[PDB]
Design a protein around this ligand. Sequence first.
Ligand code: GNP
Ligand code: 84D
Ligand code: CL
Ligand code: MG
Ligand code: MG
Length: 288
Amino acid sequence: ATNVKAMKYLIEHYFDNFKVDSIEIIGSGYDSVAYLVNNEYIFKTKFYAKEKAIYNFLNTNLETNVKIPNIEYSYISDELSILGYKEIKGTFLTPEIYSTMSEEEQNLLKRDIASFLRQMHGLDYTDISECTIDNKQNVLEEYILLRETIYNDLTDIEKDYIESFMERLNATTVFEGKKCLCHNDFSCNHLLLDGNNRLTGIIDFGDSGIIDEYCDFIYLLEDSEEEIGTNFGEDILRMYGNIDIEKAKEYQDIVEEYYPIETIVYGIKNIKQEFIENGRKEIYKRTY
Ligand SMILES: Nc1nc2c(ncn2[C@@H]2O[C@H](COP(=O)(O)OP(=O)(O)NP(=O)(O)O)[C@@H](O)[C@H]2O)c(=O)[nH]1
Ligand SMILES: NC[C@@H]1CC[C@@H](N)[C@@H](O[C@H]2[C@H](O)[C@@H](O[C@H]3O[C@H](CO)[C@@H](O)[C@H](N)[C@H]3O)[C@H](N)C[C@@H]2N)O1
Ligand SMILES: [Cl-]
Ligand SMILES: [Mg+2]
Ligand SMILES: [Mg+2]
């Protein structure tokens, strides 16, 4: 409990009347830690301005019964960011849980998801218009960073994987469609169910932005151990409606192809050799 103690100190220091009676680590990424405090509050911390701006925009503008974080505590500085909000109660959706649900239960969950996405994507985003993300341009810039750093030391197999991806990226039309506000990390580990297996809450709008509409289906369409599966995403797309399903799948496939490169780039930017090695190894796994 050393981490817990430092974070208890920081919370009490920056939020003057707040008393920490209990505190435990509830999740962690590679450069963030999330804490459950007093069995009631979530504090996300990092060594978060946009994320806060997004919860504020959404809590003003969304009409939905699905719960999202409502920021009550914030401290934001160059060196440290903390966001605190009341824990949304529920069970996180998993493949295992989904497989035990009746067909009707599954259908209601899919409809709840489609409905939420439709409402969010339909919001007039003028008041959040600073939060724009261009994925194609971001990729080009990450490629330039590769070229400026480690590209010349990569193997021919690694180089070909990258150049083949850039060729595909250049030819695709999937970045030319509707833009809207997306969650942009819409995976089942961010989806909470209530006791009837109905969608009750959504978390982690940390990557959210004005971006391609296709983006919020990337994980719903993913075939992996962590996600439900492609059929889940297809059905949600049909319920959501007025969207080109083949292009949504093309978008997901291109993003999936990019993953190893994204991993390499993260390692370069954050000076973490482990990630550079992991992404390069994953290129070999995918090639063979
Ligand atoms: N049940 C519950 N758990 C929460 C809540 N908020 C966060 N969590 C838990 O804490 C984990 C981390 O929260 P999350 O917003 O995803 O943060 P992160 O993804 O680790 N950090 P970042 O989004 O900055 O990279 C979640 O996966 C979940 O376990 C909440 O409202 N309810
Ligand atoms: N762990 C192995 C899986 C296999 C499939 C691959 N597509 C990826 O899939 C996960 C994907 O990475 C997850 O997003 C993480 O990563 C993103 C960037 O990479 C971050 O911006 C994001 N905020 C972070 O939480 C997603 N939430 C759930 C997906 N199952 O890894
Ligand atoms: Cl390496
Ligand atoms: Mg998360
Ligand atoms: Mg996140």
